[PDB]
Amino acid sequence: PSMSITRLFPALLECFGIVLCGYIAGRANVITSTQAKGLGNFVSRFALPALLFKNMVVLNFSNVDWSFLYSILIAKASVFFIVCVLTLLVASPDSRFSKAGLFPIFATQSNDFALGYPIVEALYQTTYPEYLQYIYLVAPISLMMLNPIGFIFCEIQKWKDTQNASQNKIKIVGLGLLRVLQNPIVFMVFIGIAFNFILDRKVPVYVENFLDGLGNSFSGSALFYLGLTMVGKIKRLKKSAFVVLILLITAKLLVLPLLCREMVELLDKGDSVVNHTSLSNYAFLYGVFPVAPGVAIFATQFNMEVEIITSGMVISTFVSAPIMYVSAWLLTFPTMDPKPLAYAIQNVSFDISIVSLISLIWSLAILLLSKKYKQLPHMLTTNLLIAQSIVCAGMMIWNFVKEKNFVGQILVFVLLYSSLYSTYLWTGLLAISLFLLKKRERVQIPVGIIIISGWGIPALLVGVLLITGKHNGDSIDSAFFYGKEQMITTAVTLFCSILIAGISLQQLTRHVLLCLLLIIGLFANLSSCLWWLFNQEPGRLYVELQFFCAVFNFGQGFISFGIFGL
Amino acid sequence: PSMSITRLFPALLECFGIVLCGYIAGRANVITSTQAKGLGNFVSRFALPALLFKNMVVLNFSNVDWSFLYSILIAKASVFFIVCVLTLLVASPDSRFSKAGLFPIFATQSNDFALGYPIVEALYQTTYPEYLQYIYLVAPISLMMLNPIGFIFCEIQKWKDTQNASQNKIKIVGLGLLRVLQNPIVFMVFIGIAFNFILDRKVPVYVENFLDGLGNSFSGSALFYLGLTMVGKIKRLKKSAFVVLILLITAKLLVLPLLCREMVELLDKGDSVVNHTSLSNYAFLYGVFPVAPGVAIFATQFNMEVEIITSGMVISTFVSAPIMYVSAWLLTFPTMDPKPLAYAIQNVSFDISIVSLISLIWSLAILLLSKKYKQLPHMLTTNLLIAQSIVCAGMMIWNFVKEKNFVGQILVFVLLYSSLYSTYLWTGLLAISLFLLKKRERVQIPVGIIIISGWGIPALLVGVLLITGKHNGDSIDSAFFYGKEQMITTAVTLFCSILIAGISLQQLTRHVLLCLLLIIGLFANLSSCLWWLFNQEPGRLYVELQFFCAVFNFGQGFISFGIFGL
């Protein structure tokens, strides 16, 4: 029914494909500074003003609900206040004012124009089109209130950097207001409001085509410039810098969205509760949008703490996608029938599976071209990567052959769960291998025996499961293909491999990081299976259990991509 | 009826008495820079903002005619354009942009707050009170449009003074707008408009008393500061500087008022033609207001051509009063009955007479304390000054004894016209004396004979006029006391003395300047008398003839004050 989520995935595909294409053109020394600066100037001075003007000349103020506006600004202001007070209490007074100036604006300004708008239109084009007009009401008005405050703090820092007591507060506040009004968007917003008032909701035809042409190309050009502006801005930082950056990011993506949810539910008191639920969905999806590069520009012009802000922004752009994706799906689950939930879990499984295939074949190509798998413990890690690639390809085929052929279905199921169980076991096998290398014992490693075991016991369990199991082809989910016996086997497999990991626990640090991260998802799987078997009756909690288990099982290769990928 | 002009004179009295008191406290080294700067800061930052805020919170926009506003701004803009184009065509390009920046703003900004408001309230308190609310609509709004333009020209000059081609037009226009918005009045006007919108035409009682206290003392303090700020800013300039200054002043006081009249008559098309006439009167009296010191401050901060602007402003303040006075009276004459016109001419005669008495006794005290009247040609000039003082005192008594006593009336009339005719003759006597000194002849000057003649022939003519004349006490004017015979005698007196001046024509330059300026008024008098005798029927032109003749006859001592006063 409402909230068509199927179109969300393709939109993220083009949105991040443009970014990766820009970055690829960047690091190849193909695109130089000249045309990059030209495109940036075109975006900042021509495309964005035209787009905002065309969207603001037609607004229909007479039928716009301001509960959105009040809710979003109050949530942003509360977040800004919390961040600023925390900064002033924790930061050392040597440069505390600078931090209190640039840190909290990172928590309120978001890339709602180039990035958020494609998703919101892809999700609300035919069901709630009116939502598309609220975005242009958020970024400017918020920028009117919260950002100027931070500005004067920066000026205060600059003032105490100059040690010029002659300057008064009037000059500082004047400079701050001058800086914030010098930002183009505020005065195009003002002129657009003036033109809407003057023209009485009319668009001149002579310039309508020009405005459409300038505004339609804004998104792609802005994303391309963003991709170009992250070629070499990621550098190593200190432990305290990492900690404060993580705190900032968690504030960005976990604090504002939840607060927006709660106080949107608080403020609104309308009827037709479905509309209120959709409103909360819109607010929460809005809260999770990443950080705009405008704060990076502000830091650059202020020439203070530029590197940390740039690193935070570039990391936030990448981290936003999985979180907003899981958010959209998790919010969609409660209002669906169990068979639609099964369809949704297959869909997300395919999506994460294909992305993970891209990651895994990239990693396998890198490792094979490195020729570093001849010595321990790399060959078994490559074998585990191969098992991941095979199980993800099994996801792909199985979703393609769910109800296509019979014998194909059984063979695909057998190979699929063989590879999956091989990954489960190989986690514990790498645990044992790392533990025995830790012993520093000059004893030969039975590499052939361990690899044949790691590929044979999973196959043997799959075969005996097929022999003892009973076929049940009416279950869409692969877990319930035969019934109790399969997930009893999976539970005992999990229990065994996890005990192996626990008793067990040259880039050994990389391997031990992997041998730590994998077992959390392993506990997730054990908890899911033990919950299903102990609790025959269905609770109101297994939906996110199933979703997280599928996500881990079917995108765990992302972990190896992150760790064994650079 | 309407346009009560009687209260105009006293208002000018206090307005310029405050100025002279401030100047007198200034040159006595009694008031120093400290309290002067304190009072100036109080006026600029506290009194004026409070006054404008209290007058702007209550405005009643619903019933304000904007024909005034359109008319006044279009006239000011036309004047500004004419001045700027003339400046750019005539000024040499060495510093032409600076001139085109500061010269035309001198022609549009006026002292409408401290100076004009007392006159407009004194003339329009009970008849057209609403007029008082238009003043605060003129100065800011005009300052919004015309002055900023000039600013960028100054910046252009500064830019070409720096020879920095890196700066673009955007920076220059930004600096100009920053300077003009930095002026306090614009943002108190904006905040006052905002408060009027918010409070829905209400004034808080808790601050109403404070606002009244701050705004009531603004006028006196501003006039006092203005008087202090002219102690030593008048210096000698060159001939071209004098010529351009005279051109500027004539533009100030003759161009804007007439243009405002004509295009106010053009734009308005309302009924009840009396209202339109009053509107034109208001516009013309507004156009004649002097120059505010704000342009002097602008020149000082720009540090360009400060002396010429300051001299022009300080001269304009003094020159404004006689011109606005004669304007008010001349505009009032057409709509009155002949007996009210006679009353008005007696009133203006008394006013100019008492001011001229102040001037004449000051000059006589200076000359007598100088002891420079022992040598030619000073004693006869002192005698002429004495005759002026006596004839002005005769004005005073005669207006006091117009219908009080009979024998007093005849004796006052006799002495009065004796002194007046003595002045007429003594003009020609000084002409003869200067001509005979020009001869460079070592011949004794019959000083006793010439002085006894100069005091005796006028008395003899008065006596024979009394003997041959017929008393007619029903005429309010002194000219028509007896009838034809008196002004036949005056006409022959004028004709004789003026032929003496023509055939005739050590500070001889001062004397010849006097012996040039006096005879213009002499022609005015001859023209008036010959017009009355040749044209028995009354035309529609003798009103200004009579007014100018009375003004000359009864304030000619102002001429000797200006020339024989320093």
Q: Concatenated DSSP letters for A48-75?
A: HHHHHHHHHHS--GGG--SHHHHHHHHH
Give the angle subtended at the CA of B64 by the CAs of B59 and B68, to the nearest 5°: 120
Quickly tell me which residue has 């009840």 as its tokens.
Answer: B272
* Distance, CA of B268 to CA of B276 (rounded, Å): 8
Quickly tell me which residue has 């004005």 as its tokens.
Answer: B395
B225 among the known binding-site residues? no
CB atoms within 10 A of CB B46: 15
* Distance, CA of B57 to CA of A487 (rounded, Å): 79
Question: CA of B399: how far to CAs of B338, B344, B465, B564, in Å?
Answer: 18, 12, 22, 28
* B440 backbone φψ class: left, alpha, beta (φ>0; ψ -120 to 50): left
**Could you tell me where the DSSP H helices lie in B183-255?**
184-199, 205-216, 218-228, 239-250
DSSP state of B403: S
* Distance, CA of A147 to CA of A91 (rounded, Å): 20
- The three-class DSSP label of residue A442 is coil
Distance of CA B302 to the CA centre of its chain: 29
CB atoms within 10 A of CB B404: 11
Contact indicator for A450, A381 with CB cutoff of 8 Å: no
Resolution (angstroms) equals: 5.6
Contact indicator for A393, A354 with CB cutoff of 8 Å: no
- Tell which residue, B378, B471, B390, B394, has the closest CA to residue B423: B390
Contacts with A226 (C-beta within 8 Å, 6 or more apart), sequence order: A19, A22, A111, A114, A293, A317
Contacts with A480 (C-beta within 8 Å, 6 or more apart), sequence order: A472, A486, A487
Please give the single-letter amino acid code of residue A330. L
* Distance, CA of A548 to CA of A526 (rounded, Å): 12
* Distance, CA of A451 to CA of A21 (rounded, Å): 39
User: Does the CA dihedral A535-A541-A547-A548 come out positive or negative?
Assistant: negative
CB atoms within 10 A of CB A513: 15
- Tell which residue, A449, A382, A463, A373, has the closest CA to residue A421: A463
- Tell which residue, A66, A59, A62, has the closest CA to residue A201: A59
Please give the single-letter amino acid code of residue A136. Y
Please give the single-letter amino acid code of residue A410. I
* Distance, CA of B233 to CA of B224 (rounded, Å): 16
* B4 backbone φψ class: left, alpha, beta (φ>0; ψ -120 to 50): beta
What tokens were used for A526? 């054990």
Phi/psi for B500 (5° steps) reads -60, -45
- H-run or E-run covering A37: helix A33-42
- Tell which residue, A392, A339, A395, has the closest CA to residue A363: A392
Quickly tell me which residue has 């001011």 as its tokens.
Answer: B355
What tokens were used for B342? 């006679």
B234 among the known binding-site residues? yes
Residue-by-residue DSSP string for B128-139: -GGGGGTHHHHH
Q: Give the torsion through C-alpha atoms of A494, A499, A505, A510, to 10 deg.
A: -20
- Tell which residue, A130, A146, A144, A29, has the closest CA to residue A79: A146
- Tell which residue, B289, B270, B269, B261, has the closest CA to residue B75: B261
Contact indicator for A347, A6 with CB cutoff of 8 Å: yes
Contacts with B357 (C-beta within 8 Å, 6 or more apart), sequence order: B389, B392, B393, B396, B557
Query: Is the N-terminal amide bond of B118 cis, ω within 30° of 0?
Result: no
A9 among the known binding-site residues? yes
* A91 backbone φψ class: left, alpha, beta (φ>0; ψ -120 to 50): beta
* Distance, CA of A409 to CA of B259 (rounded, Å): 97
Contact indicator for B357, B392 with CB cutoff of 8 Å: yes
* Distance, CA of A178 to CA of B174 (rounded, Å): 10
C-alpha Rg value of chain A to the nearest Å: 27
* Distance, CA of B51 to CA of B536 (rounded, Å): 56
Please give the single-letter amino acid code of residue A142. S
* Distance, CA of A519 to CA of A559 (rounded, Å): 12
- The three-class DSSP label of residue B429 is helix
What tokens were used for A238? 């200190």
Contact indicator for A132, A124 with CB cutoff of 8 Å: yes
- Buried (b) or exposed (e) across A147-173, using 16+ Cβ within 10 A? bbbbbbbbbbbbbeeeeeeeeeeeebe
B45 among the known binding-site residues? no
* Distance, CA of A384 to CA of A557 (rounded, Å): 10
* Distance, CA of A96 to CA of A214 (rounded, Å): 42
B510 among the known binding-site residues? yes
Distance of CA B41 to the CA centre of its chain: 28
Contacts with A255 (C-beta within 8 Å, 6 or more apart), sequence order: A79, A107
User: Does the CA dihedral A391-A395-A397-A398 come out positive or negative?
Assistant: positive
SS3 content of chain A, % helix, strand, coil (to 5): 80, 0, 20
- Tell which residue, B457, B537, B524, B441, has the closest CA to residue B489: B457
**Could you tell me where the DSSP H helices lie in B439-507?**
447-468, 484-504
Please give the single-letter amino acid code of residue A531. W
A428 among the known binding-site residues? no
Please give the single-letter amino acid code of residue A303. N
Residue-by-residue DSSP string for B37-85: HHHHHHIIIIIHHHHHHHHHHS--GGG--SHHHHHHHHHHHHHHHHHHH
- Tell which residue, A191, A221, A79, A219, has the closest CA to residue A135: A219
What tokens were used for A309? 């802000």
* Distance, CA of A128 to CA of A1 (rounded, Å): 12
* Distance, CA of A3 to CA of B559 (rounded, Å): 93
* Distance, CA of A154 to CA of B226 (rounded, Å): 41
User: Does the CA dihedral A55-A56-A62-A64 come out positive or negative?
Assistant: positive
Long-range contacts of A174-177 (CB under 8 A, 24+ apart): A175/A151, A176/A148, A176/A151, A176/A152, A177/A148, A177/A151
Contact indicator for B319, B139 with CB cutoff of 8 Å: no
* Distance, CA of A352 to CA of A395 (rounded, Å): 10
* Distance, CA of B459 to CA of B390 (rounded, Å): 14
Residue-by-residue DSSP string for A74-96: HHHHHHHHHHHHHHHHHS-TTSH
* Distance, CA of A184 to CA of B516 (rounded, Å): 66
Please give the single-letter amino acid code of residue A370. S
What tokens were used for B84? 């700027």
* A301 backbone φψ class: left, alpha, beta (φ>0; ψ -120 to 50): alpha
* Distance, CA of A499 to CA of A521 (rounded, Å): 14
- Buried (b) or exposed (e) across B444-463, using 16+ Cβ within 10 A? eeeeeebeeebbebbbebbe
Long-range contacts of B455-460 (CB under 8 A, 24+ apart): B455/B383, B455/B422, B457/B425, B458/B418, B458/B419, B458/B421, B458/B422, B458/B424, B458/B425, B459/B418
Which residue ranges form the domains of chain B, and what is each CATH number? 64-202+241-333 (no CATH), 338-563 (1.20.1070.10)
